Amino acid sequence: MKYLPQQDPQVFAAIEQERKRQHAKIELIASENFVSRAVMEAQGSVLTNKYAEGYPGRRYAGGCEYVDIVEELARERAKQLFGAEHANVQPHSGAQANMAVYFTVLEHGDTVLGMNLSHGGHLTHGSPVNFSGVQYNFVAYGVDPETHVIDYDDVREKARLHRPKLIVAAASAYPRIIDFAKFREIADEVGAYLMVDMAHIAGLVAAGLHPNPVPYAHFVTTTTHKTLRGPRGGMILCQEQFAKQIDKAIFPGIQGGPLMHVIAAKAVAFGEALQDDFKAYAKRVVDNAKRLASALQNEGFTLVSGGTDNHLLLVDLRPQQLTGKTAEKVLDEVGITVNKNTIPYDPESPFVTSGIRIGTAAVTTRGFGLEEMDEIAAIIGLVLKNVGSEQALEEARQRVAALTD
Amino acid sequence: MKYLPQQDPQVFAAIEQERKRQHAKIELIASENFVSRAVMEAQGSVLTNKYAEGYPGRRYAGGCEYVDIVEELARERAKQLFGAEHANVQPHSGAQANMAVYFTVLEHGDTVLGMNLSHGGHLTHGSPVNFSGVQYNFVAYGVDPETHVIDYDDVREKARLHRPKLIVAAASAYPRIIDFAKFREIADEVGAYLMVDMAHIAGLVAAGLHPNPVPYAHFVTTTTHKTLRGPRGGMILCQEQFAKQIDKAIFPGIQGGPLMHVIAAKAVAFGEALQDDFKAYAKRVVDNAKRLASALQNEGFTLVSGGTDNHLLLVDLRPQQLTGKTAEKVLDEVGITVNKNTIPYDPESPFVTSGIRIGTAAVTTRGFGLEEMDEIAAIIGLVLKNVGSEQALEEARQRVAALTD
């Protein structure tokens, strides 16, 4: 940076602190990742100056000749990446991506079937304090109490009973592979649309390590900033029959002027995803997640679903008689960043929880491998089995520092 | 740039073309402006890596210690700038800022009174193809057919008849000062909330050249990227009694994770706005708009409202027997960027129009003064009075090139 340190010393100092923090801490938040310097440079471009209401070629303003190219590059790379017939790269977030799809196919008060929020489902999949649960009539399907895998007979029973107009698949904290073929089969029986919110698994789908929902879903929403390793924003994928309706829902439906600088960075992120190195990266993410899961069990931890199939895992902390809140607090003290997360059939509230959510996407971008996964799990064991001991937390603090150079 | 040219030659080339375009063209789109290099550097920071769901201190994730400072800096500077009791700097856009306020005080199907869209009102103020007109029952007030100034007796009559729960004030294409005192007086009579969408006039309010709506409105929404000269995003200002409700409406209401890198740039933009130079800048914007308005009338053009009080003006093209579409097209050929805009009581559709919207905020940032305003208006006269002559458009093309170095 050059102009910011002179202009705003207060803001620059906090950014530099955050920059050093991201390097020092072990970042295990499943939704977080580190973007390349090329992605950031695209977000810090002059493209923020341009109002580009509308779509490439069909704009409601002149001078969009070059930002059209940028958006088309973002749309075509995404179609090439996921095998979609249409893409919309304008959603400001995953929340707005979901919102636009809901705006497309649903009237106010329509019944929608999504995943239970305490079982892995996202806030935008029917939270009573979120727009989705207030605007639409959301019913929930769950996971098996023992295996923690989606009960597909329950998805079928809830669909046949409540008769939803839309079925939503995918989650924020589900460590297993989602059977999209069964979700479409259930949707076809009740005559409902199938939406898949692949936000978390997007990068794994792009690398071919998680089944692609695109051939099975009518709508596929995602964030660009999770396993896809792009800028903070959203995207909608659909077949050409909904293409016009999806575009109208974003603009002039729920949004206004798009973020052309962020869309530029999306294109860069999609470009990086198409390369062979990203496929090797995403496999290491999955390999690291399996290794970390196995190593935590070795330490004596119980895991939700008994392991993982993707990038994230959930630790059932009930055997250790610890809450997610307590675990989150004590690991923050030693330099490990997690988040408290409800486990399926949690006896605790969403603000206390009985579990922690851990992802490997961030540490794998850094260069962490199977060996580092063994050490991370060993530190977690030392911390959580000795919460009252400051000498163990000091030992953990030094071992965290050794991993991060 | 360093890493983007190597990583993505296609995206970098289009950005460089856009960079050169912004320098070459005369940018007269009223909603557009040029951000400082410090604002861009904040948007191209590592802050995009961090999930900061919640608010400073009351986060739903750990490691937010430094991004909290950034957001607090953005919130406190905005409060210092506009004299507000509370600020929310998380809205991804002006559309989402408006959406959150609507989500706060209104149920589905509630009556809301906003400005007529063909008279100056914005898309989010009740368009039947926008979420606002579909979600809520929008009624419109208008301007006087002769003076084009808001008919405040009509605002009062529409409010007393339709009994709205909320009244929205402000516009996308209104060249005069809005009487917020009268809007609150009308709202108090019918027992309705008053929302002011100051998106366009925000920078002029910050410099004290347009009356502050804050003391009069229950809610004040705005974009940060117009006359405020900041990054592309939104903001909500309100009194402390709605503070908790407004925060809940943004998260977990309509959004998810905020854009911390954009919020950083918002803080930088607010910091730049607090300085004395910005007040001198914003006065020049107003001075330039008055000079350009007077000079266009000198050329023989009819203006909506007979001039301007702010940053923008509307040219009534009916005397020249030209549509806004035609004027927009021919000025694009010579290097002047405008947008077609409906004039009050337009006989043409919103896709053809009888007028063009012109703003001075962008050219004033460049260094354009009263002399340059005289020349810009002279070129517009040459172009629009000689649409069929290629020799005049070539003469105009060279005169545009002379203004932009």
Nearest to B384 by CA among B322, B340, B335: B322
User: Where a domain ends, among B268, B283, B298?
Assistant: B283
User: Where a domain ends, among A255, A283, A311?
Assistant: A283
C-alpha separations of A4 from A12, A14, A65, A124, B67 in Å: 6, 12, 30, 36, 16
Q: Chain A contact for B100, CB < 8 A?
A: no
What residues of chain A lie within 8 A of the CB of B76, using their CB?
Answer: none
Residue with tokens 């002769």: B146
Which of B32, B37, B123 comes nearest A252 by C-beta?
B123
SS3 at position B141: strand
- Please check whether residue A403 is in contact with residue A26, taking contact to mean a CB–CB distance below 8 angstroms: yes
- Please check whether residue B77 is in contact with residue A232, taking contact to mean a CB–CB distance below 8 angstroms: no
Cα(B339)–Cα(B308) distance, integer angstroms: 17
Contacts of A266 (CB under 8 A, 6+ apart): A74, A78, A89, A224, A230, A231, A233, A235
Tokens (6 digits) for B290: 């008055």
Instruction: Go through A54-71 and write b for each residue having 16 or more CB atoms within 10 A of its CB, e for each that does not.
Output: bbbeebbbbbbebbbbbb
- Please check whether residue A153 is in contact with residue A127, taking contact to mean a CB–CB distance below 8 angstroms: no
Note whether B214 and B236 are same-domain residues. Answer: yes
Tokens (6 digits) for A126: 């029917």
What residues of chain A lie within 8 A of the CB of B400, using their CB?
Answer: none
Q: Do A45 and B44 touch (CB under 8 A)?
A: yes
Which CATH number goes with the domain that contains A243?
A: 3.40.640.10
Nearest to B25 by CA among A49, A41, A379, A289: A49
Residue of chain B minimizing CA distance to A133: B253
SS3 at position B343: coil
Instruction: Go through B279-289 and write b for each residue having 16 or more CB atoms within 10 A of its CB, e for each that does not.
Output: bebbebbbbbb
Resolution (in Å) of the shown entry? 2.4
Note whether A24 and A65 are same-domain residues. Answer: no
Nearest to B293 by CA among B22, B10, B30: B30
- Please check whether residue A132 is in contact with residue A192, taking contact to mean a CB–CB distance below 8 angstroms: no
Tokens (6 digits) for B152: 């405040």
Q: Chain B contact for A254, CB < 8 A?
A: yes
Nearest to B321 by CA among B292, B355, B358: B355
- DSSP H helices, A300-346, are 324-334
Cα(A240)–Cα(A236) distance, integer angstroms: 12
Which CATH number goes with the domain that contains B399?
A: 3.90.1150.10
Note whether B253 and B373 are same-domain residues. Answer: no
Nearest to B171 by CA among B265, B76, B65, B304: B304
User: Where a domain ends, among B265, B283, B301?
Assistant: B283
Note whether A232 and A308 are same-domain residues. Answer: no
Cα(B186)–Cα(B57) distance, integer angstroms: 39
Note whether B125 and B261 are same-domain residues. Answer: yes
Read off the amino acid at residue A2. K
Q: What 8-state DSSP symbol labels residue B254?
A: I
Note whether B199 and B246 are same-domain residues. Answer: yes
Tokens (6 digits) for B51: 């999930």
Q: Which residues pair with B113 in a beta bridge?
A: B139, B167
Q: Chain A contact for B95, CB < 8 A?
A: yes
| A266: phi then psi, degrees, rounded to nearest 5 | -60, -50
Note whether A213 and A233 are same-domain residues. Answer: yes
Those of residues 338-397 in B touching chain A at CB distance below 8 A are 338-339
Cα(B171)–Cα(B288) distance, integer angstroms: 20
Contacts of A323 (CB under 8 A, 6+ apart): A317, A340, A348, A352, A353, A354
Note whether B58 and B12 are same-domain residues. Answer: no
Domain count of chain B? Answer: 2
Q: Are strands A336-337 and B234-238 parallel, antiparallel or unpaired?
A: unpaired
Q: What 8-state DSSP symbol labels residue A311?
A: S
Q: What determination technique applies here?
A: X-ray
The burial of B189, by beta-carbon neighbours within 10 Å (0-12 exposed, 13-18 middle, 19 or more buried), is given as exposed
Q: Quote the longest CA-to-CA distance of chain A.
A: 65
Range of the domain at B347: 1-32+284-405
Q: Chain B contact for A71, CB < 8 A?
A: no
The helix, strand and coil proportions of chain A, stated in percent and rounded to the nearest 5, come to: 50, 15, 35
Note whether A210 and A300 are same-domain residues. Answer: no
* Rg of chain A, C-alpha, whole Å: 21
- Please check whether residue B81 is in contact with residue B206, taking contact to mean a CB–CB distance below 8 angstroms: yes
Note whether A193 and A165 are same-domain residues. Answer: yes
Out of A104, A124, A221, A223, which one is annotated catalytic? A223
Note whether A253 and A318 are same-domain residues. Answer: no
Which of A44, A135, A248 comes nearest B41 by C-beta?
A44
Cα(A328)–Cα(A314) distance, integer angstroms: 13
Nearest to A40 by CA among A19, A66, A71: A19
Note whether A26 and A162 are same-domain residues. Answer: no
Strand ranges inside B90-165, DSSP E: 111-115, 137-141
| B112: phi then psi, degrees, rounded to nearest 5 | -130, 135
A68 is catalytic: no
Q: Do A38 and B4 touch (CB under 8 A)?
A: yes
Cα(B328)–Cα(B318) distance, integer angstroms: 14
Cα(B91)–Cα(B237) distance, integer angstroms: 11
Count of alpha carbons within 13 angstroms of residue A346, beta-carbon side: 27
**Which residue in A10, A19, A26, A92 has the most chain B C-beta atoms within 10 A of its own C-beta, making it the best mutation to test that interface?**
A92
SS3 at position B32: coil
- Please check whether residue A317 is in contact with residue A340, taking contact to mean a CB–CB distance below 8 angstroms: no
Distance of CA A220 to the CA centre of its chain: 13
